[PDB]
mmCIF file of all heavy atoms in Angstrom:
data_model
loop_
_atom_site.group_PDB
_atom_site.id
_atom_site.type_symbol
_atom_site.label_atom_id
_atom_site.label_comp_id
_atom_site.label_asym_id
_atom_site.label_seq_id
_atom_site.Cartn_x
_atom_site.Cartn_y
_atom_site.Cartn_z
ATOM 1 N N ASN A 11 -122.559 6.388 -137.154
ATOM 2 C CA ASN A 11 -121.819 5.157 -137.375
ATOM 3 C C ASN A 11 -121.901 4.778 -138.856
ATOM 4 O O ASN A 11 -122.923 4.273 -139.316
ATOM 5 C CB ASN A 11 -122.411 4.005 -136.560
ATOM 6 C CG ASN A 11 -121.318 3.024 -136.126
ATOM 7 O OD1 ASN A 11 -120.852 3.032 -134.998
ATOM 8 N ND2 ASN A 11 -120.938 2.181 -137.081
ATOM 9 N N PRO A 12 -120.780 5.044 -139.579
ATOM 10 C CA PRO A 12 -120.715 4.737 -140.998
ATOM 11 C C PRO A 12 -120.548 3.232 -141.226
ATOM 12 O O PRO A 12 -121.154 2.668 -142.135
ATOM 13 C CB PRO A 12 -119.544 5.550 -141.523
ATOM 14 C CG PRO A 12 -118.713 5.920 -140.307
ATOM 15 C CD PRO A 12 -119.550 5.642 -139.068
ATOM 16 N N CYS A 13 -119.721 2.627 -140.386
ATOM 17 C CA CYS A 13 -119.466 1.201 -140.485
ATOM 18 C C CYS A 13 -120.802 0.488 -140.708
ATOM 19 O O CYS A 13 -120.836 -0.623 -141.235
ATOM 20 C CB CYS A 13 -118.737 0.670 -139.250
ATOM 21 S SG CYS A 13 -117.379 1.736 -138.640
ATOM 22 N N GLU A 14 -121.869 1.157 -140.297
ATOM 23 C CA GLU A 14 -123.203 0.603 -140.447
ATOM 24 C C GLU A 14 -123.385 -0.602 -139.521
ATOM 25 O O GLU A 14 -123.504 -0.443 -138.307
ATOM 26 C CB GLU A 14 -123.479 0.221 -141.903
ATOM 27 C CG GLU A 14 -123.785 1.460 -142.747
ATOM 28 C CD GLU A 14 -124.887 1.170 -143.765
ATOM 29 O OE1 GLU A 14 -124.934 0.068 -144.334
ATOM 30 O OE2 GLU A 14 -125.717 2.138 -143.962
ATOM 31 N N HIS A 15 -123.396 -1.780 -140.129
ATOM 32 C CA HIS A 15 -123.560 -3.011 -139.374
ATOM 33 C C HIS A 15 -122.494 -4.021 -139.802
ATOM 34 O O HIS A 15 -122.801 -5.188 -140.043
ATOM 35 C CB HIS A 15 -124.984 -3.552 -139.521
ATOM 36 C CG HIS A 15 -126.008 -2.822 -138.685
ATOM 37 N ND1 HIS A 15 -126.906 -3.475 -137.860
ATOM 38 C CD2 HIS A 15 -126.266 -1.489 -138.558
ATOM 39 C CE1 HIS A 15 -127.666 -2.568 -137.266
ATOM 40 N NE2 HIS A 15 -127.269 -1.336 -137.701
ATOM 41 N N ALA A 16 -121.265 -3.536 -139.885
ATOM 42 C CA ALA A 16 -120.152 -4.382 -140.280
ATOM 43 C C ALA A 16 -118.931 -3.507 -140.575
ATOM 44 O O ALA A 16 -118.735 -3.072 -141.709
ATOM 45 C CB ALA A 16 -120.559 -5.237 -141.480
ATOM 46 N N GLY A 17 -118.142 -3.275 -139.535
ATOM 47 C CA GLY A 17 -116.947 -2.460 -139.670
ATOM 48 C C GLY A 17 -116.457 -1.975 -138.303
ATOM 49 O O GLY A 17 -117.134 -2.168 -137.294
ATOM 50 N N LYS A 18 -115.287 -1.356 -138.315
ATOM 51 C CA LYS A 18 -114.699 -0.843 -137.090
ATOM 52 C C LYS A 18 -114.887 0.674 -137.036
ATOM 53 O O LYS A 18 -114.700 1.363 -138.038
ATOM 54 C CB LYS A 18 -113.239 -1.286 -136.969
ATOM 55 C CG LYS A 18 -112.801 -1.331 -135.505
ATOM 56 C CD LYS A 18 -112.686 -2.775 -135.009
ATOM 57 C CE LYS A 18 -111.346 -3.390 -135.417
ATOM 58 N NZ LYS A 18 -110.557 -3.756 -134.219
ATOM 59 N N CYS A 19 -115.254 1.151 -135.856
ATOM 60 C CA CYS A 19 -115.470 2.575 -135.657
ATOM 61 C C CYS A 19 -114.496 3.064 -134.586
ATOM 62 O O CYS A 19 -114.555 2.622 -133.439
ATOM 63 C CB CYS A 19 -116.924 2.881 -135.290
ATOM 64 S SG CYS A 19 -117.178 3.445 -133.569
ATOM 65 N N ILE A 20 -113.620 3.970 -134.995
ATOM 66 C CA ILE A 20 -112.633 4.524 -134.084
ATOM 67 C C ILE A 20 -112.782 6.046 -134.042
ATOM 68 O O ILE A 20 -113.488 6.627 -134.864
ATOM 69 C CB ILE A 20 -111.228 4.054 -134.466
ATOM 70 C CG1 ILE A 20 -111.252 3.259 -135.772
ATOM 71 C CG2 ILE A 20 -110.588 3.260 -133.325
ATOM 72 C CD1 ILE A 20 -111.996 1.934 -135.597
ATOM 73 N N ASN A 21 -112.104 6.649 -133.077
ATOM 74 C CA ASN A 21 -112.151 8.092 -132.918
ATOM 75 C C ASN A 21 -110.811 8.693 -133.346
ATOM 76 O O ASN A 21 -109.753 8.186 -132.976
ATOM 77 C CB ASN A 21 -112.397 8.477 -131.457
ATOM 78 C CG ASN A 21 -112.092 9.959 -131.222
ATOM 79 O OD1 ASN A 21 -111.992 10.751 -132.143
ATOM 80 N ND2 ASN A 21 -111.948 10.284 -129.940
ATOM 81 N N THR A 22 -110.899 9.765 -134.120
ATOM 82 C CA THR A 22 -109.706 10.439 -134.603
ATOM 83 C C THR A 22 -109.743 11.922 -134.228
ATOM 84 O O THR A 22 -110.799 12.452 -133.883
ATOM 85 C CB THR A 22 -109.603 10.196 -136.110
ATOM 86 O OG1 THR A 22 -110.872 9.649 -136.462
ATOM 87 C CG2 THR A 22 -108.609 9.087 -136.458
ATOM 88 N N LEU A 23 -108.580 12.549 -134.306
ATOM 89 C CA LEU A 23 -108.466 13.961 -133.978
ATOM 90 C C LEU A 23 -109.136 14.790 -135.077
ATOM 91 O O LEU A 23 -108.767 14.689 -136.245
ATOM 92 C CB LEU A 23 -107.004 14.335 -133.729
ATOM 93 C CG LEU A 23 -106.565 14.387 -132.265
ATOM 94 C CD1 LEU A 23 -105.059 14.149 -132.134
ATOM 95 C CD2 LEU A 23 -106.998 15.699 -131.607
ATOM 96 N N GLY A 24 -110.106 15.589 -134.661
ATOM 97 C CA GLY A 24 -110.830 16.436 -135.594
ATOM 98 C C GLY A 24 -111.948 15.656 -136.287
ATOM 99 O O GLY A 24 -113.067 16.149 -136.413
ATOM 100 N N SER A 25 -111.608 14.450 -136.716
ATOM 101 C CA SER A 25 -112.570 13.597 -137.393
ATOM 102 C C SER A 25 -112.521 12.184 -136.806
ATOM 103 O O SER A 25 -111.618 11.860 -136.036
ATOM 104 C CB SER A 25 -112.307 13.555 -138.899
ATOM 105 O OG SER A 25 -112.199 14.861 -139.458
ATOM 106 N N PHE A 26 -113.503 11.383 -137.191
ATOM 107 C CA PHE A 26 -113.582 10.013 -136.713
ATOM 108 C C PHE A 26 -113.111 9.030 -137.786
ATOM 109 O O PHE A 26 -113.257 9.291 -138.980
ATOM 110 C CB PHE A 26 -115.052 9.735 -136.394
ATOM 111 C CG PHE A 26 -115.923 9.495 -137.629
ATOM 112 C CD1 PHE A 26 -115.840 8.317 -138.302
ATOM 113 C CD2 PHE A 26 -116.780 10.462 -138.056
ATOM 114 C CE1 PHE A 26 -116.648 8.093 -139.448
ATOM 115 C CE2 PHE A 26 -117.588 10.239 -139.202
ATOM 116 C CZ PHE A 26 -117.504 9.060 -139.874
ATOM 117 N N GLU A 27 -112.555 7.920 -137.323
ATOM 118 C CA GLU A 27 -112.060 6.896 -138.229
ATOM 119 C C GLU A 27 -112.880 5.613 -138.076
ATOM 120 O O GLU A 27 -113.284 5.258 -136.969
ATOM 121 C CB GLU A 27 -110.573 6.629 -137.995
ATOM 122 C CG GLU A 27 -110.160 5.278 -138.582
ATOM 123 C CD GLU A 27 -108.723 5.324 -139.108
ATOM 124 O OE1 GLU A 27 -108.237 6.400 -139.488
ATOM 125 O OE2 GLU A 27 -108.108 4.190 -139.112
ATOM 126 N N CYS A 28 -113.101 4.952 -139.203
ATOM 127 C CA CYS A 28 -113.864 3.715 -139.208
ATOM 128 C C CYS A 28 -113.254 2.777 -140.251
ATOM 129 O O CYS A 28 -113.072 3.161 -141.405
ATOM 130 C CB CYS A 28 -115.350 3.969 -139.470
ATOM 131 S SG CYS A 28 -116.291 2.504 -140.030
ATOM 132 N N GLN A 29 -112.950 1.566 -139.807
ATOM 133 C CA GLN A 29 -112.365 0.572 -140.687
ATOM 134 C C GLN A 29 -113.451 -0.098 -141.530
ATOM 135 O O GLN A 29 -114.630 -0.051 -141.182
ATOM 136 C CB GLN A 29 -111.571 -0.466 -139.890
ATOM 137 C CG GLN A 29 -110.661 0.210 -138.863
ATOM 138 C CD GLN A 29 -109.754 -0.814 -138.175
ATOM 139 O OE1 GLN A 29 -109.429 -1.857 -138.718
ATOM 140 N NE2 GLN A 29 -109.368 -0.460 -136.953
ATOM 141 N N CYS A 30 -113.017 -0.708 -142.624
ATOM 142 C CA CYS A 30 -113.937 -1.387 -143.519
ATOM 143 C C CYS A 30 -113.998 -2.861 -143.118
ATOM 144 O O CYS A 30 -113.057 -3.386 -142.523
ATOM 145 C CB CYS A 30 -113.535 -1.209 -144.985
ATOM 146 S SG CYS A 30 -111.820 -0.629 -145.245
ATOM 147 N N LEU A 31 -115.113 -3.490 -143.461
ATOM 148 C CA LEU A 31 -115.309 -4.894 -143.145
ATOM 149 C C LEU A 31 -115.314 -5.708 -144.438
ATOM 150 O O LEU A 31 -116.279 -5.666 -145.199
ATOM 151 C CB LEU A 31 -116.567 -5.081 -142.294
ATOM 152 C CG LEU A 31 -116.481 -6.135 -141.188
ATOM 153 C CD1 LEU A 31 -116.485 -7.549 -141.774
ATOM 154 C CD2 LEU A 31 -115.264 -5.889 -140.292
ATOM 155 N N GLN A 32 -114.223 -6.433 -144.648
ATOM 156 C CA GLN A 32 -114.090 -7.257 -145.839
ATOM 157 C C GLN A 32 -113.955 -6.373 -147.081
ATOM 158 O O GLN A 32 -112.854 -5.956 -147.434
ATOM 159 C CB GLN A 32 -115.272 -8.219 -145.976
ATOM 160 C CG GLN A 32 -114.887 -9.627 -145.515
ATOM 161 C CD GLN A 32 -115.842 -10.129 -144.429
ATOM 162 O OE1 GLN A 32 -116.736 -10.925 -144.672
ATOM 163 N NE2 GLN A 32 -115.604 -9.621 -143.224
ATOM 164 N N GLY A 33 -115.091 -6.118 -147.713
ATOM 165 C CA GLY A 33 -115.115 -5.293 -148.909
ATOM 166 C C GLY A 33 -116.130 -4.159 -148.774
ATOM 167 O O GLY A 33 -117.204 -4.205 -149.374
ATOM 168 N N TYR A 34 -115.757 -3.165 -147.979
ATOM 169 C CA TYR A 34 -116.623 -2.019 -147.759
ATOM 170 C C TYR A 34 -116.148 -0.809 -148.564
ATOM 171 O O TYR A 34 -114.997 -0.756 -148.994
ATOM 172 C CB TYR A 34 -116.521 -1.695 -146.267
ATOM 173 C CG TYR A 34 -117.730 -2.149 -145.446
ATOM 174 C CD1 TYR A 34 -118.127 -3.470 -145.476
ATOM 175 C CD2 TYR A 34 -118.423 -1.236 -144.676
ATOM 176 C CE1 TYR A 34 -119.265 -3.897 -144.704
ATOM 177 C CE2 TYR A 34 -119.561 -1.665 -143.905
ATOM 178 C CZ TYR A 34 -119.927 -2.973 -143.956
ATOM 179 O OH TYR A 34 -121.002 -3.376 -143.227
ATOM 180 N N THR A 35 -117.059 0.136 -148.745
ATOM 181 C CA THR A 35 -116.748 1.342 -149.492
ATOM 182 C C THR A 35 -116.494 2.510 -148.537
ATOM 183 O O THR A 35 -115.671 2.408 -147.628
ATOM 184 C CB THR A 35 -117.892 1.599 -150.475
ATOM 185 O OG1 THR A 35 -117.589 2.872 -151.037
ATOM 186 C CG2 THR A 35 -119.233 1.813 -149.769
ATOM 187 N N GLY A 36 -117.218 3.595 -148.774
ATOM 188 C CA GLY A 36 -117.081 4.781 -147.945
ATOM 189 C C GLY A 36 -115.947 5.676 -148.451
ATOM 190 O O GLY A 36 -115.107 5.235 -149.234
ATOM 191 N N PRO A 37 -115.961 6.948 -147.971
ATOM 192 C CA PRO A 37 -114.945 7.908 -148.366
ATOM 193 C C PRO A 37 -113.616 7.620 -147.662
ATOM 194 O O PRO A 37 -112.547 7.855 -148.226
ATOM 195 C CB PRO A 37 -115.524 9.265 -148.007
ATOM 196 C CG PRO A 37 -116.636 8.993 -147.005
ATOM 197 C CD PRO A 37 -116.941 7.505 -147.043
ATOM 198 N N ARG A 38 -113.726 7.116 -146.443
ATOM 199 C CA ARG A 38 -112.547 6.794 -145.656
ATOM 200 C C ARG A 38 -112.521 5.299 -145.328
ATOM 201 O O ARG A 38 -111.672 4.843 -144.563
ATOM 202 C CB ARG A 38 -112.518 7.594 -144.352
ATOM 203 C CG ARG A 38 -112.775 9.080 -144.617
ATOM 204 C CD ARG A 38 -113.902 9.609 -143.726
ATOM 205 N NE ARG A 38 -113.599 10.990 -143.294
ATOM 206 C CZ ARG A 38 -114.532 11.883 -142.900
ATOM 207 N NH1 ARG A 38 -115.839 11.545 -142.883
ATOM 208 N NH2 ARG A 38 -114.148 13.091 -142.533
ATOM 209 N N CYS A 39 -113.460 4.579 -145.923
ATOM 210 C CA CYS A 39 -113.554 3.145 -145.703
ATOM 211 C C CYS A 39 -114.426 2.905 -144.469
ATOM 212 O O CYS A 39 -113.959 2.362 -143.471
ATOM 213 C CB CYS A 39 -112.173 2.501 -145.560
ATOM 214 S SG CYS A 39 -111.976 0.903 -146.429
ATOM 215 N N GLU A 40 -115.680 3.320 -144.581
ATOM 216 C CA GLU A 40 -116.622 3.157 -143.486
ATOM 217 C C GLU A 40 -118.041 2.978 -144.030
ATOM 218 O O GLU A 40 -119.015 3.097 -143.287
ATOM 219 C CB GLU A 40 -116.551 4.342 -142.521
ATOM 220 C CG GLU A 40 -116.928 5.645 -143.225
ATOM 221 C CD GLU A 40 -115.679 6.405 -143.678
ATOM 222 O OE1 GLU A 40 -114.676 5.659 -143.999
ATOM 223 O OE2 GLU A 40 -115.685 7.643 -143.713
ATOM 224 N N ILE A 41 -118.113 2.692 -145.322
ATOM 225 C CA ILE A 41 -119.397 2.494 -145.975
ATOM 226 C C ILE A 41 -119.426 1.109 -146.624
ATOM 227 O O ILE A 41 -118.396 0.610 -147.078
ATOM 228 C CB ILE A 41 -119.684 3.638 -146.949
ATOM 229 C CG1 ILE A 41 -119.535 4.996 -146.261
ATOM 230 C CG2 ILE A 41 -121.060 3.472 -147.599
ATOM 231 C CD1 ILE A 41 -120.383 5.060 -144.988
ATOM 232 N N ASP A 42 -120.617 0.528 -146.650
ATOM 233 C CA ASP A 42 -120.793 -0.789 -147.237
ATOM 234 C C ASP A 42 -121.397 -0.643 -148.635
ATOM 235 O O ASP A 42 -122.474 -0.071 -148.795
ATOM 236 C CB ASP A 42 -121.746 -1.643 -146.399
ATOM 237 C CG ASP A 42 -122.045 -3.030 -146.969
ATOM 238 O OD1 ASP A 42 -122.417 -3.044 -148.205
ATOM 239 O OD2 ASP A 42 -121.928 -4.049 -146.270
ATOM 240 N N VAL A 43 -120.676 -1.169 -149.613
ATOM 241 C CA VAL A 43 -121.127 -1.105 -150.994
ATOM 242 C C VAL A 43 -121.780 -2.435 -151.375
ATOM 243 O O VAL A 43 -121.629 -3.430 -150.670
ATOM 244 C CB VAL A 43 -119.958 -0.729 -151.908
ATOM 245 C CG1 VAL A 43 -118.684 -1.473 -151.504
ATOM 246 C CG2 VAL A 43 -120.304 -0.993 -153.375
ATOM 247 N N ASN A 44 -122.495 -2.406 -152.491
ATOM 248 C CA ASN A 44 -123.174 -3.597 -152.974
ATOM 249 C C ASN A 44 -122.363 -4.213 -154.116
ATOM 250 O O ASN A 44 -122.538 -3.844 -155.278
ATOM 251 C CB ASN A 44 -124.565 -3.259 -153.512
ATOM 252 C CG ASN A 44 -125.324 -4.527 -153.905
ATOM 253 O OD1 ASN A 44 -124.754 -5.586 -154.105
ATOM 254 N ND2 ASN A 44 -126.641 -4.360 -154.005
ATOM 255 N N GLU A 45 -121.489 -5.140 -153.748
ATOM 256 C CA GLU A 45 -120.652 -5.809 -154.727
ATOM 257 C C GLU A 45 -121.512 -6.627 -155.692
ATOM 258 O O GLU A 45 -121.008 -7.159 -156.681
ATOM 259 C CB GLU A 45 -119.606 -6.691 -154.041
ATOM 260 C CG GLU A 45 -120.189 -7.370 -152.800
ATOM 261 C CD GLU A 45 -119.865 -6.568 -151.536
ATOM 262 O OE1 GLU A 45 -119.842 -5.288 -151.692
ATOM 263 O OE2 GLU A 45 -119.646 -7.160 -150.469
ATOM 264 N N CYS A 46 -122.795 -6.702 -155.373
ATOM 265 C CA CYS A 46 -123.730 -7.446 -156.199
ATOM 266 C C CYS A 46 -124.210 -6.530 -157.326
ATOM 267 O O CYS A 46 -125.123 -6.882 -158.071
ATOM 268 C CB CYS A 46 -124.897 -7.997 -155.376
ATOM 269 S SG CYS A 46 -126.492 -7.142 -155.640
ATOM 270 N N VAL A 47 -123.571 -5.372 -157.417
ATOM 271 C CA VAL A 47 -123.921 -4.404 -158.441
ATOM 272 C C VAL A 47 -122.916 -4.499 -159.592
ATOM 273 O O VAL A 47 -123.240 -4.167 -160.731
ATOM 274 C CB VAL A 47 -123.998 -3.002 -157.832
ATOM 275 C CG1 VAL A 47 -124.942 -2.980 -156.626
ATOM 276 C CG2 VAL A 47 -122.607 -2.493 -157.448
ATOM 277 N N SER A 48 -121.719 -4.956 -159.254
ATOM 278 C CA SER A 48 -120.666 -5.099 -160.244
ATOM 279 C C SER A 48 -120.361 -6.581 -160.473
ATOM 280 O O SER A 48 -119.559 -6.926 -161.338
ATOM 281 C CB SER A 48 -119.400 -4.357 -159.813
ATOM 282 O OG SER A 48 -119.296 -3.075 -160.426
ATOM 283 N N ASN A 49 -121.020 -7.415 -159.684
ATOM 284 C CA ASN A 49 -120.830 -8.852 -159.790
ATOM 285 C C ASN A 49 -122.160 -9.560 -159.525
ATOM 286 O O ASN A 49 -122.253 -10.404 -158.635
ATOM 287 C CB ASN A 49 -119.816 -9.352 -158.756
ATOM 288 C CG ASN A 49 -118.641 -8.380 -158.628
ATOM 289 O OD1 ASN A 49 -117.513 -8.681 -158.982
ATOM 290 N ND2 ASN A 49 -118.968 -7.203 -158.104
ATOM 291 N N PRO A 50 -123.183 -9.179 -160.336
ATOM 292 C CA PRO A 50 -124.506 -9.767 -160.199
ATOM 293 C C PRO A 50 -124.536 -11.187 -160.770
ATOM 294 O O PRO A 50 -125.575 -11.846 -160.751
ATOM 295 C CB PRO A 50 -125.438 -8.814 -160.928
ATOM 296 C CG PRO A 50 -124.552 -7.980 -161.839
ATOM 297 C CD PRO A 50 -123.110 -8.182 -161.400
ATOM 298 N N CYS A 51 -123.385 -11.617 -161.262
ATOM 299 C CA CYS A 51 -123.265 -12.946 -161.836
ATOM 300 C C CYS A 51 -123.966 -12.946 -163.197
ATOM 301 O O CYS A 51 -124.338 -14.001 -163.707
ATOM 302 C CB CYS A 51 -123.832 -14.017 -160.903
ATOM 303 S SG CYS A 51 -122.575 -15.090 -160.114
ATOM 304 N N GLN A 52 -124.122 -11.750 -163.746
ATOM 305 C CA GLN A 52 -124.772 -11.600 -165.037
ATOM 306 C C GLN A 52 -126.288 -11.489 -164.860
ATOM 307 O O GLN A 52 -126.762 -10.929 -163.874
ATOM 308 C CB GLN A 52 -124.411 -12.755 -165.970
ATOM 309 C CG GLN A 52 -124.334 -12.285 -167.425
ATOM 310 C CD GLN A 52 -124.626 -13.435 -168.391
ATOM 311 O OE1 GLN A 52 -125.183 -13.255 -169.461
ATOM 312 N NE2 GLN A 52 -124.220 -14.623 -167.954
ATOM 313 N N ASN A 53 -127.005 -12.035 -165.831
ATOM 314 C CA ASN A 53 -128.457 -12.005 -165.794
ATOM 315 C C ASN A 53 -128.989 -13.435 -165.674
ATOM 316 O O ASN A 53 -129.967 -13.795 -166.328
ATOM 317 C CB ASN A 53 -129.028 -11.396 -167.076
ATOM 318 C CG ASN A 53 -128.643 -12.230 -168.298
ATOM 319 O OD1 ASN A 53 -129.316 -13.175 -168.676
ATOM 320 N ND2 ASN A 53 -127.525 -11.828 -168.897
#
């Protein structure tokens, strides 16, 4: 489960599909990125 703990997980032919939740990453949109890495609000 790439969606991790926030996203949609579907089944696809040959491969599986997973939707992103809000602002998620992933190769197909099934991974959660840390937007706090590009928007740490500075220092």
